[PDB]
Design a protein around this ligand. Structure first.
Ligand SMILES: NC(=O)c1ccc[n+]([C@@H]2O[C@H](COP(=O)([O-])OP(=O)(O)OC[C@H]3O[C@@H](n4cnc5c(N)ncnc54)[C@H](O)[C@@H]3O)[C@@H](O)[C@H]2O)c1
Ligand SMILES: NC(=[NH2+])NCCC[C@H](N)C(=O)O
Length: 403
């Protein structure tokens, strides 16, 4: 029997629990530390089955029904004897789950971030301590489905499923269940999972600059005057933003190259240009693909998507109380920044974005090119956890001197 632990009670956690609990030979334990959410779930479900409505490519709707073994807030019941522990929550909530699982997780455990975001492995190492070298850490690039809860604790809808999905793996000393095949088995036929080459490849291929760049590209030097309707998000970028995106993508390659130079044997050669990525994964959606500006603006799977806005005097204004910045910076760019600091590479385009965007969310992270802001402790950058050098970043082992 494969014993799987699902962390969280969101859209993803609902979708994952339903599909995993339906696979024969799988026991699912659902753990949520959000107040008394676990109890609310159990009470809402009752004796009924957790229903997952999948919208297939045909237009037809497949219906999956299953019951998890237990939905508890007690980390002892959920974690003990778990072969796979999967975290499906926004990143600010990951710190709590690592602490909860710390005493009860077994050596042979496979810890999965679905999705991980950035600094997942640095955080896991810090909290689990020595045990992180035993377990295996697995980082997915994004959530496998676009999904929304239809009825809390009992009904969730898959709007669509990705076809391909990459996950990075850090193999520990202990032998786990096979990372790729076990995760595939739980998910079903789609997405088809492949292993990435390196975890830092996964970390930077997040492209944590994208949403902060689109928001800066439109509201950078905003005078305060309102607009009629909400302007288009991805498709509303000007040329200055396509150049801003390329410069940050170039800086991603810079950090990737420095690491391969400083530490050979770390294959980071799968780190691309954002222009190269778009033309590989959105090829069927792009009308005109001659540059990055046109690849994004004419991308059909971006139509109707607008900026977050709120009603103000004489129109609408940008809503900033979102997870575009309060997530992608502390749990994305700052991590990348710390890695770049350790790599000894300047990243001016990324720096410009960090400084503007932190100020919009009333937070301090980066100060004069140094990780010394007020809220630097709420970020997952490797320097925050004590890992100051590139070697400490790759291995998790800190330098101690004699004699
Ligand atoms: N939903 C999607 O289709 C979509 C698509 C791609 C990627 N993602 C990403 O995947 C991640 C997970 O998606 P989701 O929709 O399940 O997130 P979600 O918004 O549904 O997560 C909410 C859950 O997180 C936990 N939580 C929320 N606030 C908490 C707090 N204050 N303290 C402790 N726990 C708290 C609770 O268990 C809650 O049920 C997100 O970060 C999102 O960016 C989502
Ligand atoms: N998993 C990735 N490589 N993502 C790159 C694009 C990321 C970007 N933040 C988006 O949602 O479009």
């Amino acid at each position: 029997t494969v014993k799987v632990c699902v962390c969280g009670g969101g859209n993803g956690a609902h979708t994952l629990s339903g599909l995993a609990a339906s696979r024969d030979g799988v026991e699912v334990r659902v753990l949520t530390l959000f107040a008394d959410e676990a109890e609310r779930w159990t009470k809402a479900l009752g004796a009924d089955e957790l229903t997952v409505i999948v919208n297939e490519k045909d237009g037809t709707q497949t219906e999956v029904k299953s019951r998890p073994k237990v939905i508890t807030k007690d980390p002892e019941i959920a974690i003990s004897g778990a072969d796979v522990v999967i975290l499906t929550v926004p990143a600010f909530a990951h710190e709590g789950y690592f602490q909860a699982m710390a005493p009860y997780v077994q050596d042979s455990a496979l810890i999965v971030g679905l999705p991980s975001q950035a600094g997942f492995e640095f955080q896991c190492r810090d909290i689990l301590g020595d045990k992180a070298a035993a377990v295996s850490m697995m980082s997915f690039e994004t959530l496998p489905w676009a999904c929304r809860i239809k009825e809390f604790g009992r009904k969730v809808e898959v709007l669509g499923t990705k076809s391909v999905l990459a996950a990075s793996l850090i193999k520990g000393t202990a032998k786990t269940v096979d990372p790729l095949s076990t995760l595939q088995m739980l998910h079903g036929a789609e997405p088809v999972f492949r292993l990435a080459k390196h975890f830092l490849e996964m970390l930077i291929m997040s492209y944590s600059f994208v949403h902060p760049a689109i928001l800066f590209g439109r509201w950078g030097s905003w005078d305060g005057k309102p607009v009629p309707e909400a302007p288009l998000f991805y498709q509303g970028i000007d040329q200055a933003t396509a150049d801003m995106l390329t410069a940050c993508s170039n800086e991603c390659k810079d950090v990737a190259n420095a690491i391969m130079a400083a530490c050979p044997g770390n294959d980071l050669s799968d780190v691309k240009d954002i222009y190269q990525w778009y033309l590989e994964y959105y090829h069927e959606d792009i009308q005109d693909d001659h540059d990055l500006y046109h690849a994004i603006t004419t991308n059909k799977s971006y139509k109707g998507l607008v900026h977050p806005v709120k009603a103000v005097d004489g129109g609408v204004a940008p809503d900033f109380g979102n997870r575009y910045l309060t997530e992608d910076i502390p749990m994305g760019m700052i991590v990348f920044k710390g890695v770049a600091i350790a790599a000894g590479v300047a990243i001016p385009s990324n720096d410009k974005l960090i400084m503007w965007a932190q100020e919009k969310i009333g937070k301090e992270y980066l100060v004069d090119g140094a990780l010394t802001g007020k809220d630097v402790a709420t970020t997952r950058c490797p320097q925050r956890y004590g890992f100051n050098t590139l070697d400490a970043i790759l291995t998790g082992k800190k330098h101690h001197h004699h004699h």
